[PDB]
Amino acid sequence: YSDPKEYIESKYYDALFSIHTPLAYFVKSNLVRLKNTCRTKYGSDSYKIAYQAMLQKFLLSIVQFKDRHDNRLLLEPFSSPIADEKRKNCLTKFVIQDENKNSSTIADLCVVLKSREIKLQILLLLEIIGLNDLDWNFRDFDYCEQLDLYLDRACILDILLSSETGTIQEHKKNILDKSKEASLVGFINYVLIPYFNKKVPHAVEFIIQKLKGPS
């Protein structure tokens, strides 16, 4: 994808719908390449602004997120064919071609995608926070407010699943396995800390407190 807008649309939706793929690749590879391209195209003076605008496109207000997920919008055709292809590939893999497709395939797919997109939104936010030098805010605690709300949704989702009892069923169970990137603990240890702790360390610390205790 030559056009940067198409590149990031492609990578955001590949990251979301392509559920077996680590988010570490979205961060260390996709976001970095996009940022480079903006650096080159817009110049070192002013690229942060354009980079931010490109990311912000995929940022979901808490109201928009609730609609996307309560009404299972992710099952529906996207008018953009780049996003839509990734949706279809996900459905082909987990709802059409899987022999065990059953009565709880859809609900599990929707919760795996919801858990996954919460993480993606936290990532977008952390990236924007770093760009705008907003980390100091997390010393003693609106993008910062938005991060906070998504962290609430992350751990509530986690608790909801934990309070409850096909290959999508394994992905769902991975959300609560600490050894996996799909879990909050894994998302902290394999993504947040390695790729965000050097910039944004106060935000990372805040995330750890919010999601796990003070320890």
Swiss-Prot record:
It is found in: Nucleus. It comes from the Eukaryota. Coiled coil: none annotated. Interacts with CDC45 and SLD7. Present with 125 molecules/cell in log phase SD medium. Required for loading and maintenance of stable association of CDC45 with chromatin during initiation and elongation of DNA replication. Also involved in temporal regulation of origin firing. Required for the association of PSF1 with origins. This is DNA replication regulator SLD3.
